[PDB]
Design a protein around this ligand. Sequence first.
Ligand code: CA
Ligand code: CA
Lengths: 261, 261
Amino acid sequence: PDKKGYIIDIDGVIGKSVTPIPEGVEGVKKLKELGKKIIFVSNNSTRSRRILLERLRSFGLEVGEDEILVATYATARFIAREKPNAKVFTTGEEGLIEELRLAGLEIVDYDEAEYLVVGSNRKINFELMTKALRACLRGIRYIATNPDRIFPAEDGPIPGTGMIIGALYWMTGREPDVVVGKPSEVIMREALDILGLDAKDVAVVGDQIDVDVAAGKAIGAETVLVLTGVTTRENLDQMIERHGLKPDYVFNSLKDMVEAL
Amino acid sequence: PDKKGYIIDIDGVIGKSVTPIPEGVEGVKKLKELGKKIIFVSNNSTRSRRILLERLRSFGLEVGEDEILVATYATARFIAREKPNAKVFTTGEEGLIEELRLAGLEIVDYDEAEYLVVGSNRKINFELMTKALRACLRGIRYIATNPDRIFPAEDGPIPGTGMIIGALYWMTGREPDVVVGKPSEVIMREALDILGLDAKDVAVVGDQIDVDVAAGKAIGAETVLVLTGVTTRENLDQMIERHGLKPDYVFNSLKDMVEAL
Ligand SMILES: [Ca+2]
Ligand SMILES: [Ca+2]
């Protein structure tokens, strides 16, 4: 399982929200120590890159800007490259808006936008869905931060960004033109470019078969599933069957993966 | 074109929201004069029977409450028939809740519900969608008031009930177990029971081919399209094409249908 680089999912691997998984932290540290290059990749739809940077550092990890690729930032830079200073309307929360502005984009009303940017919003309401609907029906280019349907939260499942995607699809027939987040190749090819590595020299590590393992197959990188998050020893067979994908390796935690090098 | 009974769409035939369509109103007056039975059918998921009853009366029509079949009432009667005193969790507005209670049903939280009842809500938010998601995931019986995706408002398109349907489908893979409203046969069968007639003795009149004409076909009743609403002389041929259905009869207005009797 020995590679030049590692594309590492954060949630379920290194932390759970603000709480570090000690075996995941340890594993990262041992990886840096062995001189492996790492990029942390997250589908987080709502927080800016620097929040997640600051979070990893609060876990005790030594991490620079360029080692963090989060969907809010990935999405903003994808647009900006395509169309410098593009006029955008988003359904998303402050951290997405932040990354949009940080990439030089201009935030406008739904009827002036050249891009519709769909990200999750805990403040989603009828007015905001009306605006998205109207933007989508105007036929403007339509980007989504991530496809995730449901987030397994504290008190139970809650809607993810796929809720807005599904609503717009049902009403208009349009899916997004581009989905940025895992398992899309968009965020994955950005991570490779950042690493300066070919897929053949990279492994993709994560806690979800349908997100992280799918992401790795699509760029032709070897895949490692850890059992510190959504996938457990008790549901692994079920998840393999459910998603029709197998990881190249399974480890209890990132620490254990690293002990095998 | 003569029949014992008429299932007549309200919006676009008799009125436009609170505003009367005089040819529509006069048509109803002549149908009653001829001794015909009428049931007024609307997919409105937010308004109680009482409200549509009083609107038709304020148009100068003599109408009793048993001549009014709005989707709120149709949904509540459907559920109460299947399970008296059913416990219901709903996404809907006060007018739906009213009809549910009137039919003897009990409004409860998502984890106590025996039925998920999806109706449109202008005050839809993330908390309501989370409840709807959880109820949906529990596998309980799932009824939608009506399937309409987009309602053409004065300000422009706005989401209909199908927004919530679409969101829930995308997230969970579940479509409603039952759709009440047109063109589903469900509301059309409540209509025939309320009328005490067979489809062969009824004509279905409305302004949308994909809603009313298709509702008429689902019970094999003869269908009449009027041109006082969504469908016009100018777009008639486009609509027949778009929706792949032809009405048995087309008339400028309800008045014209009745003149031809
Ligand atoms: Ca994860
Ligand atoms: Ca109508």
